[PDB]
Amino acid sequence: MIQTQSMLDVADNSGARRVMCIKVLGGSHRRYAGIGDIIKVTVKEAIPRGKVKKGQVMTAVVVRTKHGVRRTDGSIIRFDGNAAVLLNNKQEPIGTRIFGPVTRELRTEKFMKIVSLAPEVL
Amino acid sequence: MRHRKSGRHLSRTSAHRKAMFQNMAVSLFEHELIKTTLPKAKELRRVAEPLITLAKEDSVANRRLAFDRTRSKAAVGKLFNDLGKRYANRPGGYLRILKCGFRAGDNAPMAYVELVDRPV
Amino acid sequence: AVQQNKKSRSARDMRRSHDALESNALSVEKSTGEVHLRHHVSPDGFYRGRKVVDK
Amino acid sequence: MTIGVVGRKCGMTRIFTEEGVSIPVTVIEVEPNRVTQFKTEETDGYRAVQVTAGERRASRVTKAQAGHFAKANVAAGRGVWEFRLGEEQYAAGDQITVDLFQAGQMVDVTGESKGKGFAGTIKRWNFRGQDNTHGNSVSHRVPGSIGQCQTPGRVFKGKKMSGHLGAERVTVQSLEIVRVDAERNLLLVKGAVPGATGGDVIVRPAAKARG
Amino acid sequence: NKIIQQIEAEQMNKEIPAFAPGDTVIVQVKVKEGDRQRLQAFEGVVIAKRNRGLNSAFTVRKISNGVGVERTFQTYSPIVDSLSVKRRGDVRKAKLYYLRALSGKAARIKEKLV
RNA sequence: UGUCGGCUCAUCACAUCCUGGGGCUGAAGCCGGUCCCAAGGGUAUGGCUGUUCGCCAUUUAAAGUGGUACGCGAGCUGGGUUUAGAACGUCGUGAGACAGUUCGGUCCCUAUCUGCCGUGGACGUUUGAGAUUUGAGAGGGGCUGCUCCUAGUACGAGAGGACCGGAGUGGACGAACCUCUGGUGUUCCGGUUGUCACGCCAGUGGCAUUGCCGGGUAGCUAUGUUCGGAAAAGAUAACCGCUGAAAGCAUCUAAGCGGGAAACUUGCCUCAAGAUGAGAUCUCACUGGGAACUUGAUUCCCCUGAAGGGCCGUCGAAGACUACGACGUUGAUAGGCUGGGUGUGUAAGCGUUGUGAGGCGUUGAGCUAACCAGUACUAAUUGCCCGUGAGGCUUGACCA
RNA sequence: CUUGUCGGGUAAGUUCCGACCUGCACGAAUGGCGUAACGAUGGCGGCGCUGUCUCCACCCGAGACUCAGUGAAAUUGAAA
RNA sequence: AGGUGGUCGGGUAGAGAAUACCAAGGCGCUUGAGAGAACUCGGGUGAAGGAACUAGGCAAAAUGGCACCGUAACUUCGGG
RNA sequence: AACCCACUCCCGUUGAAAAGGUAGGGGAUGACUUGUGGAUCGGAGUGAAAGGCUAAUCAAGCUCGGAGAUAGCUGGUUCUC
RNA sequence: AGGGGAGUGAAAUAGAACCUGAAACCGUAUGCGUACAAGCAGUGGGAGCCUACUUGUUAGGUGACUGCGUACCUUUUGUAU
Ligand SMILES: [Mg+2]
Ligand SMILES: [Mg+2]
Ligand SMILES: [Mg+2]
Ligand SMILES: [Mg+2]
Ligand SMILES: [Mg+2]
Ligand SMILES: [Mg+2]
Ligand SMILES: [Mg+2]
Ligand SMILES: [Mg+2]
Ligand SMILES: [Mg+2]
Ligand SMILES: [Mg+2]
Ligand SMILES: [Mg+2]
Ligand SMILES: [Mg+2]
Ligand SMILES: [Mg+2]
Ligand SMILES: [Mg+2]
Ligand SMILES: [Mg+2]
Ligand SMILES: [Mg+2]
Ligand SMILES: [Mg+2]
Ligand SMILES: [Mg+2]
Ligand SMILES: [Mg+2]
Ligand SMILES: [Mg+2]
Ligand SMILES: [Mg+2]
Ligand SMILES: [Mg+2]
Ligand SMILES: [Mg+2]
Ligand SMILES: [Mg+2]
Ligand SMILES: [Mg+2]
Ligand SMILES: [Mg+2]
Ligand SMILES: [Mg+2]
Ligand SMILES: [Mg+2]
Ligand SMILES: [Mg+2]
Ligand SMILES: [Mg+2]
Ligand SMILES: [Mg+2]
Ligand SMILES: [Mg+2]
Ligand SMILES: [Mg+2]
Ligand SMILES: [Mg+2]
Ligand SMILES: [Mg+2]
Ligand SMILES: [Mg+2]
Ligand SMILES: [Mg+2]
Ligand SMILES: [Mg+2]
Ligand SMILES: [Mg+2]
Ligand SMILES: [Mg+2]
Ligand SMILES: [Mg+2]
Ligand SMILES: [Mg+2]
Ligand SMILES: [Mg+2]
Ligand SMILES: [Mg+2]
Ligand SMILES: [Mg+2]
Ligand SMILES: [Mg+2]
Ligand SMILES: [Mg+2]
Ligand SMILES: [Mg+2]
Ligand SMILES: [Mg+2]
Ligand SMILES: [Mg+2]
Ligand SMILES: [Mg+2]
Ligand SMILES: [Mg+2]
Ligand SMILES: [Mg+2]
Ligand SMILES: [Mg+2]
Ligand SMILES: [Mg+2]
Ligand SMILES: [Mg+2]
Ligand SMILES: [Mg+2]
Ligand SMILES: [Mg+2]
Ligand SMILES: [Mg+2]
Ligand SMILES: [Mg+2]
Ligand SMILES: [Mg+2]
Ligand SMILES: [Mg+2]
Ligand SMILES: [Mg+2]
Ligand SMILES: [Mg+2]
Ligand SMILES: [Mg+2]
Ligand SMILES: [Mg+2]
Ligand SMILES: [Mg+2]
Ligand SMILES: [Mg+2]
Ligand SMILES: [Mg+2]
Ligand SMILES: [Mg+2]
Ligand SMILES: [Mg+2]
Ligand SMILES: [Mg+2]
Ligand SMILES: [Mg+2]
Ligand SMILES: [Mg+2]
Ligand SMILES: [Mg+2]
Ligand SMILES: [Mg+2]
Ligand SMILES: [Mg+2]
Ligand SMILES: [Mg+2]
Ligand SMILES: [Mg+2]
Ligand SMILES: [Mg+2]
Ligand SMILES: [Mg+2]
Ligand SMILES: [Mg+2]
Ligand SMILES: [Mg+2]
Ligand SMILES: [Mg+2]
Ligand SMILES: [Mg+2]
Ligand SMILES: [Mg+2]
Ligand SMILES: [Mg+2]
Ligand SMILES: [Mg+2]
Ligand SMILES: [Mg+2]
Ligand SMILES: [Mg+2]
Ligand SMILES: [Mg+2]
Ligand SMILES: [Mg+2]
Ligand SMILES: [Mg+2]
Ligand SMILES: [Mg+2]
Ligand SMILES: [Mg+2]
Ligand SMILES: [Mg+2]
Ligand SMILES: [Mg+2]
Ligand SMILES: [Mg+2]
Ligand SMILES: [Mg+2]
Ligand SMILES: [Mg+2]
Ligand SMILES: [Mg+2]
Ligand SMILES: [Mg+2]
Ligand SMILES: [Mg+2]
Ligand SMILES: [Mg+2]
Ligand SMILES: [Mg+2]
Ligand SMILES: [Mg+2]
Ligand SMILES: [Mg+2]
Ligand SMILES: [Mg+2]
Ligand SMILES: [Mg+2]
Ligand SMILES: [Mg+2]
Ligand SMILES: [Mg+2]
Ligand SMILES: [Mg+2]
Ligand SMILES: [Mg+2]
Ligand SMILES: [Mg+2]
Ligand SMILES: [Mg+2]
Ligand SMILES: [Mg+2]
Ligand SMILES: [Mg+2]
Ligand SMILES: [Mg+2]
Ligand SMILES: [Mg+2]
Ligand SMILES: [Mg+2]
Ligand SMILES: [Mg+2]
Ligand SMILES: [Mg+2]
Ligand SMILES: [Mg+2]
Ligand SMILES: [Mg+2]
Ligand SMILES: [Mg+2]
Ligand SMILES: [Mg+2]
Ligand SMILES: [Mg+2]
Ligand SMILES: [Mg+2]
Ligand SMILES: [Mg+2]
Ligand SMILES: [Mg+2]
Ligand SMILES: [Mg+2]
Ligand SMILES: [Mg+2]
Ligand SMILES: [Mg+2]
Ligand SMILES: [Mg+2]
Ligand SMILES: [Mg+2]
Ligand SMILES: [Mg+2]
Ligand SMILES: [Mg+2]
Ligand SMILES: [Mg+2]
Ligand SMILES: [Mg+2]
Ligand SMILES: [Mg+2]
Ligand SMILES: [Mg+2]
Ligand SMILES: [Mg+2]
Ligand SMILES: [Mg+2]
Ligand SMILES: [Mg+2]
Ligand SMILES: [Mg+2]
Ligand SMILES: [Mg+2]
Ligand SMILES: [Mg+2]
Ligand SMILES: [Mg+2]
Ligand SMILES: [Mg+2]
Ligand SMILES: [Mg+2]
Ligand SMILES: [Mg+2]
Ligand SMILES: [Mg+2]
Ligand SMILES: [Mg+2]
Ligand SMILES: [Mg+2]
Ligand SMILES: [Mg+2]
Ligand SMILES: [Mg+2]
Ligand SMILES: [Mg+2]
Ligand SMILES: [Mg+2]
Ligand SMILES: [Mg+2]
Ligand SMILES: [Mg+2]
Ligand SMILES: [Mg+2]
Ligand SMILES: [Mg+2]
Ligand SMILES: [Mg+2]
Ligand SMILES: [Mg+2]
Ligand SMILES: [Mg+2]
Ligand SMILES: [Mg+2]
Ligand SMILES: [Mg+2]
Ligand SMILES: [Mg+2]
Ligand SMILES: [Mg+2]
Ligand SMILES: [Mg+2]
Ligand SMILES: [Mg+2]
Ligand SMILES: [Mg+2]
Ligand SMILES: [Mg+2]
Ligand SMILES: [Mg+2]
């Protein structure tokens, strides 16, 4: 679960290193964003010649959380950190590569592109 | 809430509650009939009775275990020599509680705790 | 906080209509005819036809 | 509605489906219910059936209840319950088992919830606490204000205050029967059932259903 | 609780070999990506266990692509197709939660040869 | 009669912000504008500032306007303002002043009455008792997004894009629960530092915040799991009618007959006969004498006190005390005991290897709270007190 | 007037830092402008850390509650 | 639970008259017993976040020893 | 550290206390702290200056006198027709 | 400790906290009223019950039910306020 002021690293290659959540989208008074949830972030650290800058406001999808995701047989998968992928205006990834593993809850129509690029899908 | 919980606080810390019942059990083995408050007598049978069960089998490891729980050399010898042989064929229930009124000082309900088969 | 008027005689006696004391369950030992509290050892040291403490 | 069974709550467990899904299940043991009395329009007004289940030792059954239990040769059990039936016929001494239910079959379960003794406004009414620092004075879980100034000048009836989260009668609606066991007299229901293990529960067909 | 025990005992027929915390195990996990049914492998060290009959569980931990991931399996779930011990570990504890703060060579488990 | 703002908790109006129903449009569609009906339920988080406001950033279906001592300090705060200290600008010869700035600056009260939230005692309900009940009445609840199919269809040159109907999945809110995922778990098991003690070695114990820690059973619990808001019926609002004259036409209206909304009455949940209008049903118990009258719903004495209730005891996922629920030897109510389970993690002693710390074996050992099952070993006595002795009169209808 | 205007810092800065000069109403021993070290001094910003907070949960002691003993206080025209 | 001048002052750890566990010596603080509600006080642990709290990081959490390596602007040449 | 002090929070506010306590805080060889004895006082003393302190009293101490100061101001003022 | 008798005394309810022994205040006994009823507690009317004796055109005690009815002082233009 991700809320406002949470810091999470970037699993893309878009030039950003750390982003901060500034809004959880999709409902009034909504509190937490899980894996597969769309959020609004600000870029906190970036590569000198990346394709995003410091202080830039944009949209990301949460891809990897320490809280985890639960399956229908009761099992749970957890990760050692929180990660996101930055998206452009039409809701496609901005980078071209994805670092680290992702989960199968991300195999939606609008995020199937980033499932294919991921080295491993848990 | 207290649902399905065992043990009385008796308005003491956990360390001072443990020392007090250690003393009470040692006195009970030495005199075989003591007088105390009724709530204290009902919590005592969860401490003294498991010690009599342990003394039925005599071995170095059992006697050390009894000494760790009663830091008394006289109590360890009274067990393993008198109690444990007297109750060899007794399946539990080695002490008996009998209500005996109230104290004058604060109107506290009192009880008698004695071993079942005292020689007298 | 304190009263704005003093309580009347009748008002405080109504509050005490629950202050009465109840009695205890007393029994008589069949062997000696001695009165004692129910489920308690008698002042002479008997319970259920047996001598338990003998003072 | 209009007819059901009385049972005991045994506890919770799981059922694993062959496709690898875990179902949370409450186990309800329904000892076969016995019909004690049948109430009709012409002799009681409304229309219902009176039922009992279990056993009760003879020293704990009064002579008024023994005679009632003996008009129907039905023997005495713990508790007596009625079900308000629409158009069903029952005779004294009849049996009602888990056989009126099937797999599927959304049902309603009624029980007596666990009792919290005397609750505060935070736990009972989901109030929100005040500051824990920043100068607060002995007022961390207290309820705050309870009214207004001279206008009305009284506390309104129904105000949310503290005391006794109940051991009350609550009903949970639209629960799915996972398994009906007729030989062990068991109902396997998906979800949670009010009360503690060993409490009395009533299972009835769902009143809403439809959707 | 005597009849819940019987309801749970009828669902426990899997083989389920013997393993311990600190062991390196391989778990075959059933995946249905549509109509096709395949098995996936999850290799890592067992860091926790839970012995509760039908409600038993175990947690294994691994490093995928520079990111640590750990999964808690339900032992008698049909999603766990099979299990096998690859290596045995020599540890003193029952729950190896201290491995979360160790990363590389400091996270190695001694091998129980016999 | 304590004056701003914040927190906590609210309650009402409607001049309606969203959701619902309509008329007109300079309404093609998708969007809108304006007016009418409607108060059921909803109705942001932050940066700055003491701020209410306001401006910004990003949300939302929407971020309503007002009353309530500009609601709420015997509920909290004390940033602002309005004591005493000190300083700047300005004014005054000066003491000093400023409704101009600036730094600092004690917020008391054990609840009598009304009120409200819970929980009992007494009496009554016309003989008394155990149990099950009807429902006059009252409370709770009532929110909404997105996606897909109808259908790239109606509409439109194209761009774009529906009404009506159907399915799925969310947000916020509420209830219950503890199977799962976790938290806690000073009552269970280990590691370890300093020191004191048990004669000493080994092994243990006290104290150091539970000394510090690593795990963790039951119970409790959310962040975990399951469920809910309905559909439907009725009477209506605005609005749309049918037939129809007064008034040869016209006209929803004057007679008559309709459709119609989250509002109202039910339907869903909970309480409920102190509903003194005190209701209903099943079953149970009680079938002796005298005396005085002020001579009948009268009083007194002897005898006889049932059904049942309580006291008391062993307890409880019930509990502030109560009440409620189970049991009291014809007994598994509590403790113990015996098995198991669970947790921890290979005890002590002994034997080997080493100069020793230590290792290895016996050994997944030893110990194990609240859990499961069985078992009268211990404790629930062998008792007392309440509660009576057939249930008034009048009128009517059936029997005899 | 005023949250002056421009720049920096933040997603967003009535506070902060650097400037401009239109100084309502600075200014040279009621000293002017600087200044290393020092300060339980005022303002602003970071890292670490966290129950401050989202949003509270469980546990431990002392009260509160019940029983026995002793036993106040402010207040009060009278109260069905 | 306040204040009150001077003298003595052991062991094991320790720089120490700090601190901890003890010695000689002294004491358990003149109401007790229960039960284990809300709420108040003093504490322990806490999922995922990490100042979003607030007038303000108030309070809490955190750091903390000895030896060695290493250390900036600025400076009144001591410092920092 | 002792010792002297009093910056912050909380508790306490009918207090254990008519100014304290627990947890943190400052100085700690000096313009230091402290015992005993002595000197200065009421329009007077003393003051690293707050109108502070001078026996829980200070923009002029306490005590007894002038003295029953004065009070165009509040309050009260007693049996019957 | 305090009492019940017995004695002294004209009288101990003149008994040493001692003449008389009021009121506030606190009790025990008897009679009538009071558990569906709303407010300055009284008063106009008024049934029933109890007691006494003249046995009801009487005296004493209670007061079901019912009509009216917002204390006193001060100060004021004006107070249930
Ligand atoms: Mg128990
Ligand atoms: Mg106590
Ligand atoms: Mg200790
Ligand atoms: Mg009072
Ligand atoms: Mg009052
Ligand atoms: Mg008054
Ligand atoms: Mg008053
Ligand atoms: Mg007054
Ligand atoms: Mg009383
Ligand atoms: Mg309970
Ligand atoms: Mg809850
Ligand atoms: Mg809050
Ligand atoms: Mg809070
Ligand atoms: Mg205070
Ligand atoms: Mg506090
Ligand atoms: Mg009023
Ligand atoms: Mg409320
Ligand atoms: Mg109104
Ligand atoms: Mg309107
Ligand atoms: Mg509107
Ligand atoms: Mg319109
Ligand atoms: Mg208008
Ligand atoms: Mg509305
Ligand atoms: Mg509204
Ligand atoms: Mg409303
Ligand atoms: Mg309405
Ligand atoms: Mg409605
Ligand atoms: Mg906000
Ligand atoms: Mg501010
Ligand atoms: Mg929106
Ligand atoms: Mg309002
Ligand atoms: Mg106000
Ligand atoms: Mg308002
Ligand atoms: Mg306040
Ligand atoms: Mg205020
Ligand atoms: Mg206050
Ligand atoms: Mg107020
Ligand atoms: Mg008030
Ligand atoms: Mg207060
Ligand atoms: Mg202020
Ligand atoms: Mg001043
Ligand atoms: Mg001048
Ligand atoms: Mg200050
Ligand atoms: Mg009042
Ligand atoms: Mg009132
Ligand atoms: Mg009513
Ligand atoms: Mg309602
Ligand atoms: Mg309703
Ligand atoms: Mg909402
Ligand atoms: Mg759980
Ligand atoms: Mg834990
Ligand atoms: Mg040690
Ligand atoms: Mg020694
Ligand atoms: Mg030794
Ligand atoms: Mg050894
Ligand atoms: Mg040793
Ligand atoms: Mg030790
Ligand atoms: Mg010691
Ligand atoms: Mg100590
Ligand atoms: Mg000590
Ligand atoms: Mg520590
Ligand atoms: Mg621990
Ligand atoms: Mg755990
Ligand atoms: Mg647990
Ligand atoms: Mg309708
Ligand atoms: Mg016509
Ligand atoms: Mg017409
Ligand atoms: Mg008409
Ligand atoms: Mg209609
Ligand atoms: Mg709706
Ligand atoms: Mg409707
Ligand atoms: Mg009734
Ligand atoms: Mg009523
Ligand atoms: Mg009835
Ligand atoms: Mg009987
Ligand atoms: Mg009985
Ligand atoms: Mg009890
Ligand atoms: Mg048996
Ligand atoms: Mg038992
Ligand atoms: Mg056993
Ligand atoms: Mg095990
Ligand atoms: Mg070994
Ligand atoms: Mg060994
Ligand atoms: Mg050990
Ligand atoms: Mg081995
Ligand atoms: Mg084991
Ligand atoms: Mg300004
Ligand atoms: Mg400015
Ligand atoms: Mg600017
Ligand atoms: Mg700020
Ligand atoms: Mg700033
Ligand atoms: Mg500037
Ligand atoms: Mg200017
Ligand atoms: Mg100047
Ligand atoms: Mg000059
Ligand atoms: Mg000047
Ligand atoms: Mg300067
Ligand atoms: Mg200084
Ligand atoms: Mg200074
Ligand atoms: Mg500075
Ligand atoms: Mg800031
Ligand atoms: Mg809590
Ligand atoms: Mg406690
Ligand atoms: Mg008492
Ligand atoms: Mg008392
Ligand atoms: Mg001193
Ligand atoms: Mg020393
Ligand atoms: Mg020191
Ligand atoms: Mg000490
Ligand atoms: Mg000592
Ligand atoms: Mg000594
Ligand atoms: Mg004391
Ligand atoms: Mg606390
Ligand atoms: Mg605290
Ligand atoms: Mg704490
Ligand atoms: Mg802590
Ligand atoms: Mg713990
Ligand atoms: Mg945390
Ligand atoms: Mg953590
Ligand atoms: Mg951080
Ligand atoms: Mg902030
Ligand atoms: Mg804020
Ligand atoms: Mg604040
Ligand atoms: Mg701080
Ligand atoms: Mg903290
Ligand atoms: Mg601290
Ligand atoms: Mg600290
Ligand atoms: Mg520096
Ligand atoms: Mg000073
Ligand atoms: Mg502190
Ligand atoms: Mg201090
Ligand atoms: Mg010094
Ligand atoms: Mg010097
Ligand atoms: Mg010097
Ligand atoms: Mg100095
Ligand atoms: Mg000197
Ligand atoms: Mg002198
Ligand atoms: Mg002199
Ligand atoms: Mg003078
Ligand atoms: Mg002077
Ligand atoms: Mg001066
Ligand atoms: Mg002076
Ligand atoms: Mg001054
Ligand atoms: Mg004096
Ligand atoms: Mg003074
Ligand atoms: Mg003068
Ligand atoms: Mg004169
Ligand atoms: Mg005078
Ligand atoms: Mg005057
Ligand atoms: Mg005048
Ligand atoms: Mg006056
Ligand atoms: Mg006067
Ligand atoms: Mg005489
Ligand atoms: Mg006399
Ligand atoms: Mg006399
Ligand atoms: Mg005389
Ligand atoms: Mg006299
Ligand atoms: Mg008198
Ligand atoms: Mg009386
Ligand atoms: Mg009456
Ligand atoms: Mg009525
Ligand atoms: Mg009244
Ligand atoms: Mg009259
Ligand atoms: Mg009369
Ligand atoms: Mg009258
Ligand atoms: Mg009258
Ligand atoms: Mg009136
Ligand atoms: Mg009137
Ligand atoms: Mg007056
Ligand atoms: Mg006036
Ligand atoms: Mg006036
Ligand atoms: Mg006038
Ligand atoms: Mg008037
Ligand atoms: Mg008045």
Curated annotation (Swiss-Prot), chain A:
Gene3D superfamilies to which the protein is assigned, alphabetical: Ribosomal protein L14
CDD domains reported in the protein's UniProt record: Ribosomal_uL14
Single Gene Ontology BP annotation: translation
Superkingdom of origin: Bacteria
Record-linked SUPFAM superfamilies: Ribosomal protein L14 (SSF50193)
GO molecular function: large ribosomal subunit rRNA binding; structural constituent of ribosome
GO CC aspect terms: cytosolic large ribosomal subunit
Matches recorded under Pfam families: Ribosomal_L14
UniProtKB keywords: Ribonucleoprotein, Ribosomal protein, RNA-binding, rRNA-binding
Family membership noted in the UniProt record: Belongs to the universal ribosomal protein uL14 family.
PANTHER family: 50S/60S RIBOSOMAL PROTEIN L14/L23, LARGE RIBOSOMAL SUBUNIT PROTEIN UL14M
Subunit structure of this chain's protein: Part of the 50S ribosomal subunit. Forms a cluster with proteins L3 and L19. In the 70S ribosome, L14 and L19 interact and together make contacts with the 16S rRNA in bridges B5 and B8.
Function statement: Binds to 23S rRNA. Forms part of two intersubunit bridges in the 70S ribosome.
Protein name according to UniProt: Large ribosomal subunit protein uL14
Gene: rplN
UniProtKB/Swiss-Prot annotation, chain B:
UniProt entry keywords in alphabetical sequence: Ribonucleoprotein, Ribosomal protein
MF annotations from Gene Ontology: structural constituent of ribosome
Signal sequence coordinates: none
Any one Pfam family match given in the protein's UniProt record, by short name: Ribosomal_L17
Superkingdom, taxonomy of origin: Bacteria
Any one of the GO CC terms: cytosolic large ribosomal subunit
One Gene Ontology term from the biological process aspect of the record: translation
Subunit structure: Part of the 50S ribosomal subunit. Contacts protein L32.
PANTHER family per record: LARGE RIBOSOMAL SUBUNIT PROTEIN BL17M, RIBOSOMAL PROTEIN L17
Family: Belongs to the bacterial ribosomal protein bL17 family.
Protein name (database record): Large ribosomal subunit protein bL17
Species per Swiss-Prot/TrEMBL record: Pseudomonas aeruginosa (strain ATCC 15692 / DSM 22644 / CIP 104116 / JCM 14847 / LMG 12228 / 1C / PRS 101 / PAO1)
Gene: rplQ
Swiss-Prot record, chain C:
Signal peptide start-end: none
Residue numbers spanned by region Disordered: 1-55
Gene Ontology biological process terms from the UniProt entry: translation
Pfam families recorded: Ribosomal_L32p
GO cellular component, one term: cytosolic large ribosomal subunit
Keyword terms of this UniProt record: Ribonucleoprotein, Ribosomal protein
Amino acid composition bias (Basic and acidic residues), ranges on this chain: 10-21
InterPro entries: Ribosomal_bL32, Ribosomal_bL32_bact, Ribosomal_zn-bd
GO molecular function: structural constituent of ribosome
Endoplasmic reticulum is among the record's keywords: no
Assigned protein family: Belongs to the bacterial ribosomal protein bL32 family.
Name of the protein in its database record: Large ribosomal subunit protein bL32
Gene source species: Pseudomonas aeruginosa (strain ATCC 15692 / DSM 22644 / CIP 104116 / JCM 14847 / LMG 12228 / 1C / PRS 101 / PAO1)
Lineage: Bacteria, Pseudomonadati, Pseudomonadota, Gammaproteobacteria, Pseudomonadales
From Swiss-Prot, chain E:
Record's keyword terms, sorted: Ribonucleoprotein, Ribosomal protein
UniProt keyword Cell division present: no
Lineage top rank: taxon: Bacteria
One term of GO molecular function: structural constituent of ribosome
Biological processes, Gene Ontology terms: translation
Disulfide bonds: none
Pfam families recorded: Ribosomal_L19 (PF01245)
Gene Ontology CC entries for this record: cytosolic large ribosomal subunit
Role description: This protein is located at the 30S-50S ribosomal subunit interface and may play a role in the structure and function of the aminoacyl-tRNA binding site.
PANTHER family (UniProt xref): LARGE RIBOSOMAL SUBUNIT PROTEIN BL19M (PTHR15680:SF9), RIBOSOMAL PROTEIN L19 (PTHR15680)
Recorded family membership: Belongs to the bacterial ribosomal protein bL19 family.
Protein name: Large ribosomal subunit protein bL19
Provenance organism: Pseudomonas aeruginosa (strain ATCC 15692 / DSM 22644 / CIP 104116 / JCM 14847 / LMG 12228 / 1C / PRS 101 / PAO1)
